[PDB]
Amino acid sequence: MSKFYKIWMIFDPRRVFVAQGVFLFLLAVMIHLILLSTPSYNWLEISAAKYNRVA
């Protein structure tokens, strides 16, 4: 269990960290886009309805 750190002797941290950044940003963007494409969770439209902003 304790030895998980040895992965950094087999991968270069530059490559891993860039891949992590790309991975996490894409995942976050994908999730926010799905919520925006879900009418029950599109916060801009929820607010528009709540405050009677259209007509």
Binding site for another protein (CB under 8 A): 1, 3-15, 18-19, 22-23, 25-26, 29-31, 33-34, 36-39, 41-47, 51, 53
Rounded Cα–Cα distance for residues 14 and 8 (Å): 10
Q: By CB under 8 A, is residue 1 in contact with a second copy?
A: no
Cβ at position 2, least distance to ligand SPO in Å: 11
Cβ at position 45, least distance to another protein in Å: 6
Rounded Cα–Cα distance for residues 24 and 17 (Å): 10
